[PDB]
RNA sequence: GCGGUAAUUCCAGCUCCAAUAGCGUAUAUUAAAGUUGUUGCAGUUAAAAAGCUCGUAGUUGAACUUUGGGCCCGGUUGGCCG
RNA sequence: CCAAGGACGUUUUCAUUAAUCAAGAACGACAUAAACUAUGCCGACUAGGGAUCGGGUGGUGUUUUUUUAAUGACCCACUCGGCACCUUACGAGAAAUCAAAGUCUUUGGGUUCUGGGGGGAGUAUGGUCGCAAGGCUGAAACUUAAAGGAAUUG
RNA sequence: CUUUGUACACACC
């Protein structure tokens, strides 16, 4: 059983929104994970590294484990979660949960001539976390994801077949480069392109239209 | 304010600014035509007179220079031209 | 700018937009040209001419009343000085400061401002030589500065 | 956008702000959607009939949401003399 | 547009300059307020009352658009208007929070006071800054009773009044309830006034 | 002219070998090739596909033994 | 304007500044001064032959307690003394 | 001192578009500014603009749309041959389907696409996307 | 960093791994290196703004001068007609 | 007493005379400093708020003189130019913090100087200036896997 | 127990 407490969770329990694109369309805050793995059943998880963190006290050193998890399905939707916990299996468990609540879409585009399905990104983009800057550049077909294997795993979970990557800063800090890559793949839907210059009729929210299958 | 008319500012605010900070720069000074007691001899005096301006007929000095607008003497009759 | 100080203050004149001006002035052009040549006959710099026609009579600028500017008609009327007014005021300020320095040796900021004044003098002399309003080989030295004020 | 011959692609064509005409991201949690009901000749609003104005998080964070809302409200005619073009 | 029955009628204008709503703040002035109108000597300012009336009928058109009346939240941490927001709660759907606004009330689903609305209405954005900040997280529109020096950031519809007066806050809140009650349709008489006196929406010292 | 001449030559060569299909002749499916399409055209796997060997290793020892 | 000149006729300044700042690296100065030719024991060569002079029992640095079983040799081409470490286990019985 | 007037112009456009305002004042309006804004206007990036003239140098008032991401100048104006046009558009454009590099050729100031169509080259001025 | 009598790191056996008729070591050099920075570094506190000013060479330097409107001719990409 | 200087005011004059500066020169508690804002100069733009200093404009504003004029000193509103102060972060940063240390991978407004892990070492030598003390320029052999910055828990 | 300083971390031996 689920028994959600949100109007959004109650409406997706009822089956009112049949695809996740209304959530990003109306910028609704995803608030419980069961919305995500009900609407997106095809996502897989991978845990990159487990690093011990130490908090030093007057009596020994308290140990916990920080686990980073990247989830997502191989067409469109990516999530990244970082959670520290006193036990390791709870750390991957809360990691996949937090990575489920952080699902964002990807602007996949064409490097040229727009022939088939979209293989690369639409534009160059960057992300910065700490001292780490990650730059993503569109690449021709069959070039592959030329990247360090952590962010290579991230964008092959994203759905890109080929991209060029550049990095600057202390990239050996894994959390900072994964968060910078997450910001870079999140900024792809921040750029305004001339194919998006057309105006839209501003669609009405599902939170308002189906408001009597809501919480009240 | 993120939408405003830079082409047509209101008269109060365009008179509010410094003279070089308007739409087109222009002087805020003016010329007066001043009549002195005795002989008529209408004179034109700039507002920031910068010197002791007298009537051409006789030494009947109308303004004394001051670091801003120059003060005019006690017996005058001036109009803005 | 203000190369010989640190001030950034802006204070100047704002010339009006009316190039033909001012539709309340009744004197003729030749009246004010004879006014400038009569006023420059008694030995006045063109800045004093401009302010003195600006305040005694109604003259906004002599450029807009006549067809041309001031020492253009002075050099056409044969009253152009052998050196123009800005360099002349700079060199007379220089010989005044040098007179102070020969009077009092220890005014050492006066030495500093003397170097500043001769720097401005050499810059204007270079500009006036490359436009040949001064002949080439003209150079400023202090012994000729004592008599060049005239 | 499109590929060569039909088959509409680019899932989630995003909304655009009605004030600065920039697009609104998926996690822009400060962005809002003002819904104004319109009135038909009786002083009463009709349920389901709206005009709709989307505001991004940046203009709302700068405090300029109310002046821009004044401008788009007066542009649509439902407001009369609050916002002036001449400032 | 509007069918011109919603203009500022003279008796409501008599109420607004009876409550001294036009007495705004001092010469301190937020630059995002062009409602100032003949800045008066002593340094106090007079606001365009007609602009306040059109902003208030805007706020009524905002509130009437929401289907469920229980999905609007009235905030009062300032001690001068808890009775007014409670009478708004009694007269409409209008769930109130009077007094201390608990942090994590719009986020943080675990808490016992978890509301998540479609609208929040405040009195003073300076005093209710936590409610405005929490509305900024969950994509919530804001209607406010702003000042001439109030921090208008994250504020969508700002009704220009003064919140330093006892009469003005309660009476403006009363006109908001009156106009939303006409727009919903229970108050069927557009010309006739409401039988409820504005003296109901006032703060009393005991 | 350079693109036309060398592109038509390159797709002509790749469709002559068999590493590229006859309907993929747009010079960008050339960028979509993989190494398995090259590996499928060796004489080893062709002897296997023709049914003379029953394995790739029997194909190797059949080819090398003339 | 970010330090360096950016004018279209300022290539000489960039070249001379790049030379002066190229002298600040370690490998460039080591190559251009010919320090491998002059002050290196090998004279810039990869290998060198020599005559063993004696054996040493060189201690290992901290924290490590061992004796490293080195030798002192003299190079044929220059004639300077050189300490060399005999690599593996029991090989000091081969280099007497 | 004020060296590149076009640089200050494009910087003013960039700052006004980053702040979100829909209008911007430019001082003091050389000809290449007018041609630059004409090129940006014909591609649907800015819209209408206005030439205030005082008797000194002129001012420009531009109405800004939301369509502009970044406009920039390149200083100094490098000499660009034919191969350097697509080396530059590889260098400093976002993608291969949009974005325009502006260069002044002897046949006027134009974007890189119609410079490719006219088969001319020149000196690089700036870029817009 | 391992070895101080329970060595996953030494000496051997077994097993496994990587390249393979090739594989290791030393030296130099290139990429990695946005640690030479034109593209493309940094200078408050991590290495680094000359004590301040004048000043020659060097580098760089406000705006403005023919624009717009028409009338024809003929090429390339297309396009039903195939 | 002597000259100099900034800002202001200006419908005064010149006309691009300019910005930064190797060499060189002046000043510097002989040429130094924790000579510091540890933040080069010039130019443009970008959120505020009040106080203060110098000037100017206006307000039948207040007060004083000769109730009353002009002044002056206040007050109000403004504007220019300063030393600064307080709040935020759209932005920057590794952070402390910053309206500049912002408009820098969406990387070019102009220009001068300096640095390339830590010691050896601002040492030796060679020049150069100084009466001297010293000042400027200034290595290498060798040695080492860290020195160092900002924040968090004890 | 708060604040403050540290070049202490096998921690002021």
Residue numbers in the entry:
A (entry chain R): 34 to 249
B (entry chain f): 2 to 82
C (entry chain Y): 2 to 151
D (entry chain a): 1 to 87
E (entry chain P): 2 to 207
F (entry chain W): 67 to 132
G (entry chain c): 2 to 97
H (entry chain b): 2 to 130
Original paper wording:
In addition to the native sample, we generated an Otu2-40S complex sample in vitro for cryo-EM analysis. To that end, we reconstituted an Otu2-eS7-Ub-40S complex using an in vitro ubiquitination system. Herein, purified 80S ribosomes were monoubiquitinated with purified Not4 E3 ligase, Ubc4 (E2), Uba1 (E1), ubiquitin and ATP to obtain 80S with monoubiquitinated eS7 (eS7-Ub-80S). These ribosomes were split into subunits and purified eS7-Ub-40S were incubated with purified recombinant Otu2 to ensure efficient deubiquitination activity in this system. After observing complete eS7-deubiquitination by recombinant purified wild-type (wt) Otu2, we used the eS7-Ub-40S for reconstitution with a 5x molar excess of purified catalytically inactive otu2-C178S to form stable complexes and determined the structure by cryo-EM. All described structures were refined to a high average resolution of 3.0 Å for Otu2-Ub-43S-PIC, 3.3 Å for Otu2-Ub-48S-IC, 3.8 Å for Otu2-pre-40S, and 3.0/3.2 Å for the two bodies of Otu2-Ub-40S. Further insight into the role of Otu2 could be gained from our in vitro reconstituted Otu2-40S structure, which shows that presence of the Otu2-NTD alone on 40S would sterically clash with the 60S subunit in context of an 80S ribosome. Most intriguingly, α4 occupies the binding position of LSU protein eL19, that forms the functionally important intersubunit bridge eB1270. Helix α4 of Otu2 occupies a very similar position on ES6e, most likely involving basic amino acids including a patch of four consecutive lysines and arginines (Lys116-Arg119; BP1). Moreover, binding of the α1-α2 hairpin induces a small translational movement of the lower h44 towards the left foot to form the binding pocket.
